[PDB]
UniProtKB/Swiss-Prot annotation, chains A, B, C, D:
Full-sequence portion shown in this chain: 1 to 73 of 229
Effect of residue 72 to K: No effect on ADP-ribosylation
Residues covered by the Ubiquitin-like domain: 1-73
Modification sites for (Microbial infection) ADP-ribosylthreonine: 66
Membrane topology, from the record: Peripheral membrane protein
Modified residues (Phosphoserine): 65
This protein's name: Ubiquitin
Organism whose genome encodes this protein: Homo sapiens
Positions marked as site (Essential for function): 68
Cross-link named Glycyl lysine isopeptide (Lys-Gly) (interchain with G-Cter in ubiquitin), sites: 6, 11, 27, 29, 33, 48, 63
Gene this protein is translated from: UBB
Length: 73, 73, 73, 73
């Protein structure tokens, strides 16, 4: 599966994931590609901020889905 | 950050926000907790009705601040 | 709603109000536009001097109404 | 040399290997002991998924090392 991520600055990043991947596995791939600490990642989908424990399937995230990544601190 | 909201009927509601949260993010949390449409929310602070575009920091709203929520239609 | 205000000197001022606005909310908008202390405002409508506590609807003030503003001290 | 393998279900399996053994020789011993098709084996060490072509020495896997075996499909 592939999914996409958009940032508050307009930039998109592609990621290869699996329907079983947890949310903490998703930002941790984001830590491999862009270097952002996972603790400093907010991932937003269909109006809910994702929780590290659940999975992509849990949140009904399929192929071609676009998440939102807000950074905080 | 936490802030508070008082109503013309004497009831207070607690909200967890951030100094970067916009005013439209604030009533939209109020739409999650009490069900009121945001378009039907007036938020009043230090004598000014808040504007959806600005932020809590913009209006100098810190931790422990109390807003006022007037409903119209 | 819009209403109008005339002065003993012939000058008119427009105000945007609501049928629920009290009389003390009306002069206080007048304190924002012209700087006159509200305690120094008399508002006259259909032969009665308005009371701070009542409302525009209470006095049957509709859209397009013209009030009279007498200043005292 | 001996190395160990842990599964997402908590079970460990011992294997006898050599520092020259490739990763495809390692899952293929796993196909002899537990019957899992090698194509259906993920082998994870020090944060990297191993590649069939490289060797145990290539990935700095010594005696007493513990790998991780994730099954997919």
């Amino acid at each position: 599966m592939q999914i996409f991520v958009k940032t508050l600055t307009g930039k998109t990043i592609t990621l290869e994931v699996e329907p079983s991947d947890t949310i903490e596995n998703v930002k941790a791939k984001i830590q491999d590609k862009e270097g952002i600490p996972p603790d400093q990642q907010r991932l937003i989908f269909a109006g809910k901020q994702l929780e590290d424990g659940r999975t992509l399937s849990d949140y009904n995230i399929q192929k071609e889905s676009t998440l939102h990544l807000v950074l905080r601190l």
